[PDB]
Scaffold this active site. Structure first.
Site, short mmCIF file in Angstrom:
data_model
loop_
_atom_site.label_atom_id
_atom_site.label_comp_id
_atom_site.label_asym_id
_atom_site.label_seq_id
_atom_site.Cartn_x
_atom_site.Cartn_y
_atom_site.Cartn_z
N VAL A 47 1.50 -56.02 42.20
CA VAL A 47 1.51 -55.01 41.19
C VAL A 47 1.14 -53.80 41.41
O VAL A 47 0.99 -53.35 42.73
CB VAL A 47 0.27 -55.77 39.99
N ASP A 57 -5.26 -55.05 25.85
CA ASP A 57 -6.59 -54.11 25.61
C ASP A 57 -7.22 -54.52 24.57
O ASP A 57 -7.28 -55.78 24.31
CB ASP A 57 -6.21 -52.47 25.71
N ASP A 93 -2.10 -48.37 45.42
CA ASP A 93 -0.77 -47.98 45.28
C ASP A 93 -0.56 -46.30 45.25
O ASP A 93 0.31 -45.72 45.54
CB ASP A 93 0.26 -48.66 44.52
N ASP A 133 -2.60 -34.37 48.79
CA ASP A 133 -3.21 -33.12 47.74
C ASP A 133 -4.76 -33.60 47.64
O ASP A 133 -5.51 -32.59 46.89
CB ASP A 133 -2.50 -33.06 46.28
N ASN A 144 -13.86 -49.50 38.79
CA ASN A 144 -14.80 -48.47 38.71
C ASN A 144 -16.05 -48.52 39.12
O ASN A 144 -17.11 -48.21 38.42
CB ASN A 144 -15.05 -48.17 36.97
N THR A 170 2.89 -29.62 41.05
CA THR A 170 2.60 -29.97 42.64
C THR A 170 1.29 -29.28 42.86
O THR A 170 0.86 -29.64 43.72
CB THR A 170 4.00 -29.16 43.01
N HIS A 195 -11.02 -48.34 22.78
CA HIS A 195 -10.60 -48.17 24.27
C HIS A 195 -9.08 -48.26 24.10
O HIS A 195 -8.13 -47.60 24.88
CB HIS A 195 -11.23 -49.46 25.03
N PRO A 223 -1.54 -57.79 45.43
CA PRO A 223 -0.72 -56.74 45.85
C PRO A 223 0.70 -56.54 45.29
O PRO A 223 1.32 -55.31 45.35
CB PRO A 223 -0.56 -57.35 47.36
CA CA Z 1 0.58 -53.09 45.13
HG HG Z 2 -7.77 -44.79 27.73
HG HG Z 3 -8.38 -48.75 27.60
#
Ligand code: CA
Ligand code: HG
Ligand code: HG
Length: 279
Positions: free
Chosen positions: A177, A39, A200, A260, A161, A16, A69, A175
């Site tokens: 997912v 991936d 989310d 947080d 990113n 926490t 990756h 939305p």
């Molecule tokens: Ca969502």
């Molecule tokens: Hg990764």
């Molecule tokens: Hg990845």
């Protein structure tokens, strides 16, 4: 159970507060659930997978991860040392080439494949799909994600990113997912993380140590890296019987650590994935 001197991201999701180093988790560890990692592929022979990983589909000449990756992201889902759900089963679907790139048509095919394939697997506790990828907005890519979710798979996708609103990104802007942003050790939003109302939940995304190709390990940063923390957490919670595929994202947001994070723009959720473990 407790993993002492764990990777920071693992400790953070069972705490926490920031700055702890032990990952606390239920011993069930996501056994009986399955996570598809869509991936660059998975190096299934890596010792850290303990024979729990396998390649089930490729769209290229080989099923081998020549990039790293996919192996890294699978590791964050369910490797012994680096994984959230240490006893889950992992299935690799290679939609990205060894440079890390793929056409939308092949990413869509990979999603439709998982929706069907899960029907011939034994995954008593439920099925998750982890997509640490995305590009510019496409309604077709959003639609494939929505189909996969409605088929009964918990879909977790990267927010992107670009330090931008994720509404303009596909993977992310659907939305229905679970769209995941990235945070760092100190509970700041990662500098690169997309944000916006379509997010989310956040997970650890900066300096994430995990498995790499050639049976090695590697620390890497990116909102891509946060995705598998939430995918693993879903599988873990589903095996615990706390939530189902359809409601997992909501359950995770409900039980998250709230407020947080710093450097969250107005209109973006301030929620950090949290396992709520109690010994
Ligand atoms: Ca969502
Ligand atoms: Hg990764
Ligand atoms: Hg990845």
């Amino acid at each position: 159970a407790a993993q002492t001197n764990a990777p920071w991201g693992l400790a953070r999701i069972s705490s926490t507060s920031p700055g702890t180093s032990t990952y606390y988790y239920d011993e069930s560890a996501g056994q009986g659930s399955c996570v598809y990692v869509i991936d660059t592929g998975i190096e299934a022979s890596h010792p850290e997978f303990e024979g729990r990983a396998q390649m089930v589909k490729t769209y290229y000449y080989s099923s081998r991860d020549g990039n790293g990756h996919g192996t890294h992201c699978a590791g964050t889902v369910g490797s012994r040392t680096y994984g959230v759900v240490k006893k889950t089963q992992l299935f690799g679907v290679k939609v990205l080439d060894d440079n890390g790139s793929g056409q939308y048509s092949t990413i869509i095919a990979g999603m439709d494949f998982v929706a069907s394939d899960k029907n011939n697997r034994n995954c008593p506790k439920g099925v998750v799909a982890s997509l640490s990828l995305g590009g510019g907005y496409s309604s077709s890519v959003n639609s494939a994600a929505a189909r996969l979710q409605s088929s009964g798979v918990m879909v977790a996708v990267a927010a992107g990113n670009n330090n931008a609103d994720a509404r303009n990104y596909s993977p992310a802007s659907e939305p229905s997912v679970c769209t995941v942003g990235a945070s760092d050790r100190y509970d700041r939003r990662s500098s690169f993380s997309n944000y916006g109302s379509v997010l989310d939940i956040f997970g650890p995304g900066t300096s994430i140590l995990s498995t790499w190709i050639g049976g090695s390990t590697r620390s890497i940063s990116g909102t891509s890296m946060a995705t598998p923390h939430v995918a693993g957490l879903a599988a873990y919670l589903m095996t615990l019987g706390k939530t189902t595929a359809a409601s997992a994202c909501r359950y995770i947001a409900d039980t998250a650590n709230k407020g947080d994070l710093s450097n969250i723009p107005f209109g973006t959720v301030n929620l950090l994935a949290y396992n709520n473990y109690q010994a």
